[PDB]
Design a protein around this ligand. Structure first.
Ligand code: 2UY
Ligand code: S6P
Length: 585
């Protein structure tokens, strides 16, 4: 029938109460699952939120139970990390013709960028040619942009990969798809497998291969699941690797920028840092070298979330300043200003939030006096500015900008990384009364840029910014239980997630849910057979441009009514959230 092939993979909606025993629920990839810890995130206050997400973040480090999924500290995973590290060594030994690529859509691509820099720095500091580079879906514009649509072409991924692999003789391609989902990555991995002489694919994600996307890719004949299954076969001969620990579901469902990206860093910095530090020691990388690093990262979570109460406060002040109609600024020096930018930009697609809502700033890249003249004018009684730095930064530049912002804002808090025994200049740094000083033990670094300290610091900041930005929005009633219902359908993955949410909250049939969403997307044109049979990109291209698509579709399903009727109902309610919540009642 028209539509049958396109929606073929979509499991039917369970009957009421048999949600567990239809095993629709066991096919929901871990990455898309609803984390049980956050059943009621829409009711937690700011302090609970920080707890529950700090709890969710912890599941990264949790170990394997006794018929269940391999985890970060499982021996199969660590054994793979070792083997990969070893393959990076082969390349570090022969850098003439060598290249290491870290590739990913969205936050995966963002994380790939940061990392590729760090390991480029580390070889600069040893007088070695930088071997790292990155690819991000939609080119480098994408790194600091919201560009969700760009992950859907396998050909694109392959083109970006063909460019960079120039006339290199040995290329390690680390494709990062948290959900083992993005066609961008898919293509690359497959391309790698077709030319084993030159390429080595390593696939990073956080689902078992059996939960890897298996829907058709528009410009490609295989699915991620097939590509991934075949890589798993080649691992037996060390010509491909799959690094896929389960870190548990995201505190906000499907928001892989959070635990996903954190784990992407934890997992890869660890592995690569081990590989470098062990080559010039003349030693092979062991599980012991990796575990030192893993446990340092695990400490970082404890170090970070021990400031919970103050994190909860920054949230309350970001929540509030948005609750009015004010803006929030994240002002960071070096890498922590990037991470600031990346958090803020992600708020657009993740929350339907304007690019001013939570903006990030690096000293997007507007230096001291430039920031002073340009932006400082636009601040207000209600805004919130957030300073993010270390004590090794140049706090003469820092103190200045605070002094100025203080005048016009007064809602300023800060995020300050320090070793023990560094002290915050100006005993009257009461510009910040109750800082978030995050103070790091002394650690036995050997490399000159002290890269372990770097990686700890980024991640700690990422957890903070992530929890804060996420929490503020949750507090404002915009999340439904632990799902973003009202997202913007801007790629195929989000189209399927929308459909899954309609099935969940309506309980009504797959076919009904599909019919309601397509109607919502394409209204005022009614369902033709063309539309039914169209490639999901057609739906995406049309949905991406409209507002409240998913809520409207859900309202039509519950009230068993037309798009016309549901639109008019909506418009005649105080808000989208209030409308949906009481239709659900
Ligand atoms: C938990 C929940 O039921 C839900 C939420 C989302 C999804 C869902 C979202 C996206 C996708 S996806 O096709 O884009 C995808 C993404 C990554 C991957 N490795 N494989 C497939 N699938 C979802 N559900 C699903 C996928 C495969 C089999 C059964 C269910 N399914 C269920 C809801 F409450 F959110 F509705
Ligand atoms: O890491 P994946 O599963 O390949 O997905 C990559 C991107 O879709 C993902 O990073 C998305 O852009 C973020 O907003 C996650 O909230």
């Amino acid at each position: 029938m028209p539509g049958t092939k396109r929606f073929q993979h979509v499991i039917e909606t369970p009957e009421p109460g048999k949600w567990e025993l239809s095993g629709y629920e066991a096919a929901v990839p871990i990455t898309e699952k609803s984390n049980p810890l956050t059943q009621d995130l829409d009711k937690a206050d700011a302090e609970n939120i920080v707890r529950l997400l700090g709890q969710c973040d912890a599941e990264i480090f949790q170990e394997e139970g006794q018929s269940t999924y391999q985890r970060l500290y499982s021996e199969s995973i660590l054994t793979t990390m070792v083997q990969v590290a070893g393959k990076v060594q082969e390349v570090l030994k022969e850098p003439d013709g060598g290249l290491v690529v870290l590739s990913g859509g969205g936050t995966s691509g963002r994380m790939a960028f940061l990392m590729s820099v760090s390991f480029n720095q580390l070889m600069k500091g040893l007088g070695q040619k930088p071997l790292y580079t990155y690819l991000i879906a939609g080119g480098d514009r994408s790194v600091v942009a919201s560009r969700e649509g760009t992950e859907d072409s396998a050909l694109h991924g392959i083109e970006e990969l063909k460019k960079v692999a120039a006339g290199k003789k040995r290329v390690i391609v680390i494709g990062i798809s948290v959900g083992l989902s993005a066609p961008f990555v898919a293509g690359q991995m497959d391309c790698c497998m077709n030319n084993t002489a030159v390429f080595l694919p390593v696939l990073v994600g956080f689902n078992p291969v059996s939960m890897a996307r298996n829907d058709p890719i528009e410009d490609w004949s295989s699915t991620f699941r097939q590509v991934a299954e075949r890589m798993q076969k080649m691992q037996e001969k060390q010509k491909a690797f799959v690094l896929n620990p389960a870190i548990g579901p995201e505190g906000l469902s499907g928001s892989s920028r959070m635990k996903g990206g954190s784990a992407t860093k934890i997992l890869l910095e660890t592995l690569l840092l081990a590989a470098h530090k062990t080559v010039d020691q003349g030693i092979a990388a062991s599980q012991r070298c990796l575990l030192e690093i893993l446990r340092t990262f695990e400490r970082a979570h404890q170090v970070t979330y021990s400031q919970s109460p103050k994190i909860a406060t920054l949230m309350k002040s970001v929540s509030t300043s948005l609750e009015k109609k004010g803006h929030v600024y994240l002002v960071g020096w070096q890498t922590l200003g990037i991470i600031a930018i990346m958090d803020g930009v992600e708020c657009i697609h993740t929350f339907g939030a304007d690019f001013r809502d939570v903006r990030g700033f690096l000293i997007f890249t507007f230096s001291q006096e430039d920031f002073l003249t340009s932006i400082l004018p636009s601040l207000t009684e209600i805004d919130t500015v957030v300073f993010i730095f270390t004590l090794d930064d140049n706090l003469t530049e820092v103190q200045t900008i605070v002094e100025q912002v203080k005048e016009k804002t007064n809602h300023i808090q800060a995020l300050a990384h320090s070793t023990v025994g560094q002290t915050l200049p100006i005993p009257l740094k009461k510009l910040f009364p109750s800082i978030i000083s995050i103070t790091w033990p002394l650690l036995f670094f050997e490399y000159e840029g002290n890269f372990i300290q770097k990686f700890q610091r980024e991640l700690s900041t990422k957890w903070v910014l992530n929890t804060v930005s996420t929490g503020a929005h949750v507090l404002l009633g915009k999340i439904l239980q632990n799902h973003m219902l009202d997202l913007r359908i801007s790629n195929s993955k989000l189209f399927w997630r929308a459909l899954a949410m309609l099935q969940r909250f309506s309980g009504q049939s797959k076919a009904r849910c599909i019919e309601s969403l397509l109607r919502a997307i394409h209204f005022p044109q009614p369902l033709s057979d063309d539309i039914r049979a169209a490639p999901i990109s057609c739906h995406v291209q049309v949905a991406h441009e409209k507002e409240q698509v998913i809520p409207i579709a859900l309202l039509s399903l519950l009230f068993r009514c037309s798009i016309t009727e549901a639109q008019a109902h909506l418009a005649a309610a105080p808000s989208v959230c209030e409308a949906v919540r009481s239709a659900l009642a």
